[PDB]
Amino acid sequence: TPWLLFGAGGKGVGARTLELALAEQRPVVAVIRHADAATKLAQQGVQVFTGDACDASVVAAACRAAGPDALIISTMGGAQDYLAHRTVIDEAEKAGISRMILVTSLGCGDSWPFLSERAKAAFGQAVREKTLAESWLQTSQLDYAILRPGGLLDGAATGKAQRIQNQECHGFVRRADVAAHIHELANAPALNQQVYSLIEPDLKPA
Amino acid sequence: TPWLLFGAGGKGVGARTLELALAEQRPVVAVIRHADAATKLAQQGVQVFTGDACDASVVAAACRAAGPDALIISTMGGAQDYLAHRTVIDEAEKAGISRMILVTSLGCGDSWPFLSERAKAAFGQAVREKTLAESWLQTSQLDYAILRPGGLLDGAATGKAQRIQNQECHGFVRRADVAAHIHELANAPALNQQVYSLIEPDLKPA
């Protein structure tokens, strides 16, 4: 079943998640800002809609191409984080899509009381915006999983990252392992409106 | 301690809460859309800033007049619920205000799973928008209380409405009792980031 990815430009979690789908020969639709990145992704077989996730027109088109049975995966970041996500969720519903995995971060939502002051100073506003995105998703018609990774690191997947629920967490996780967890959640029979923290215990930056 | 009220135009919860403050000769500041309602409230001794709660200048002006020791009370229910409350909350921080009581509705936030399909059809988007407002407040620098009333009814205060937490709730409550509960929370030593449902058990419309 097709995947529609937002935030898969660049080299982060989205990029790695898209590469897993491609290696699988899975139908993939993505929205990408840069025209040149678009064609290079298109040559790998991605159906690339060029534009911005705040563009309701571009978003609707991508949703239409993916189809009502598609899974949306969002790893978006940046200026217009809440609005971009509201657009995606709203257009998803209109297109008959009913499943979405949203990747935010530790500190969002009910994990906010455990966010450190140092982390809040650096990422506070981004986290609050992503929290609005979680909210809009949780009150939407979509089935969902929300994944809140801790500090993102590069490197090879370790397979040691753990999904944790309903409890304070702090730590790090490799981007490659967040992609693996997205893949696992996506392939399960249902998302079941779940919220998870995601860290590899005791993993640390060098 | 001065009260800065949003949504106190009209005759609803805000208006009744404003009455309570005036009756005890509390300094009161308010943002009011219509000039005639404004002048009328002003003759009762309200410092009334005329304009819309999405207007940052007007909101800052009111915040300045209230001062850093003020309590904000919001009973707003417009068409741009989220944006209005974000403006209020942002400008409050800028003005050094550190306390806010936000009145939303049963069905907001983590009470969303228990909202009836009928109520969702009638009030769905308004509740989701108010839920975004709740979120922004809960991740702000302000100490807060959120009050979520059941179905609102006119009529005299019964004194029998009850604050309920962390459990599914259904029912009705007099607007006047919502104003009484706001006053009690306000005069307590601290809001302490609490969320409450508010209904009168066995109360019915007829």
Side-chain angles (χ1 to χ4, degrees):
Chain A
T1 59
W3 287 2
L4 170 53
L5 313 195
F6 297 91
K11 246 225 188 168
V13 172
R16 290 180 179 74
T17 304
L18 185 143
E19 181 48 44
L20 295 172
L22 278 191
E24 270 187 327
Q25 313 203 257
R26 181 165 242 136
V28 169
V29 186
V31 173
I32 299 292
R33 263 165 309 182
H34 296 358
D36 75 320
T39 301
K40 283 189 208 161
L41 268 202
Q43 291 165 8
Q44 298 186 66
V46 180
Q47 303 156 250
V48 178
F49 287 80
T50 313
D52 186 273
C54 292
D55 191 328
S57 173
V58 172
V59 174
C63 286
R64 193 161 200 129
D69 303 314
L71 173 69
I72 289 176
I73 296 161
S74 182
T75 57
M76 282 199 288
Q80 294 300 320
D81 205 317
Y82 152 65
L83 206 95
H85 280 110
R86 180 173 182 155
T87 303
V88 169
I89 296 162
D90 289 352
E91 290 299 325
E93 287 170 340
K94 300 186 195 175
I97 290 177
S98 66
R99 293 172 68 232
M100 178 161 175
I101 294 175
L102 172 68
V103 180
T104 59
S105 64
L106 272 187
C108 292
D110 64 349
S111 73
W112 179 263
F114 313 117
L115 193 58
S116 76
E117 287 305 302
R118 151 161 66 108
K120 191 178 306 183
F123 307 113
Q125 282 302 108
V127 164
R128 295 178 76 198
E129 297 282 340
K130 290 173 180 308
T131 300
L132 297 182
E134 295 188 348
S135 184
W136 203 252
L137 179 59
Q138 288 175 295
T139 64
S140 73
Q141 296 169 66
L142 303 187
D143 193 16
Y144 65 88
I146 290 157
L147 207 55
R148 297 171 178 161
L152 302 176
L153 301 169
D154 297 329
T158 69
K160 297 169 74 167
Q162 299 181 359
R163 290 192 302 275
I164 295 162
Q165 298 186 280
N166 298 312
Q167 58 192 265
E168 172 174 16
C169 199
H170 308 269
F172 295 81
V173 58
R174 296 205 165 163
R175 290 183 167 90
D177 285 289
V178 185
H181 277 259
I182 294 162
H183 189 267
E184 182 199 342
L185 285 176
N187 280 71
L191 299 176
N192 286 332
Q193 297 183 125
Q194 294 296 305
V195 175
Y196 315 95
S197 294
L198 184 59
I199 55 161
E200 175 180 333
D202 299 339
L203 175 63
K204 224 109 217 218
Chain B
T1 59
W3 287 3
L4 171 50
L5 307 157
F6 297 89
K11 294 177 191 286
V13 172
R16 296 161 202 253
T17 305
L18 188 152
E19 298 170 29
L20 295 184
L22 290 189
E24 54 184 352
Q25 299 94 13
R26 185 188 304 285
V28 173
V29 186
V31 177
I32 296 292
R33 180 182 293 176
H34 291 72
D36 60 353
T39 294
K40 179 173 187 173
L41 272 173
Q43 297 166 344
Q44 292 168 251
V46 192
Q47 310 159 246
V48 183
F49 291 75
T50 305
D52 168 69
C54 295
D55 190 340
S57 295
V58 175
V59 174
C63 283
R64 183 176 225 119
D69 298 334
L71 168 70
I72 291 176
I73 295 161
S74 179
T75 53
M76 282 195 288
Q80 294 300 320
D81 269 330
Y82 157 58
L83 288 183
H85 285 105
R86 181 164 177 158
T87 303
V88 163
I89 294 166
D90 288 350
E91 290 302 330
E93 282 167 348
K94 288 175 168 63
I97 287 170
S98 61
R99 297 176 68 226
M100 181 165 169
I101 299 181
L102 173 67
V103 179
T104 61
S105 178
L106 219 47
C108 292
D110 66 343
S111 67
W112 177 262
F114 317 118
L115 191 59
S116 79
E117 279 303 317
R118 181 175 59 263
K120 282 192 190 182
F123 303 115
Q125 293 304 109
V127 168
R128 300 177 72 195
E129 291 262 319
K130 285 190 169 73
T131 300
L132 295 179
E134 289 191 357
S135 179
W136 203 248
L137 180 59
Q138 289 175 296
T139 59
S140 78
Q141 301 166 44
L142 275 53
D143 189 25
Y144 64 85
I146 292 161
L147 204 48
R148 300 174 176 158
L152 298 179
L153 302 171
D154 291 338
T158 67
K160 303 180 179 177
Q162 300 172 22
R163 290 195 300 278
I164 297 175
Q165 304 190 273
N166 298 121
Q167 82 195 54
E168 175 182 7
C169 207
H170 299 292
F172 297 80
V173 57
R174 298 269 190 236
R175 290 181 165 85
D177 282 289
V178 186
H181 277 265
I182 291 166
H183 183 273
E184 189 202 331
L185 292 172
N187 282 28
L191 304 172
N192 277 332
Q193 304 170 43
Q194 292 300 306
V195 178
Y196 315 91
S197 292
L198 183 61
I199 61 166
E200 172 173 355
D202 308 321
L203 177 60
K204 270 141 229 195

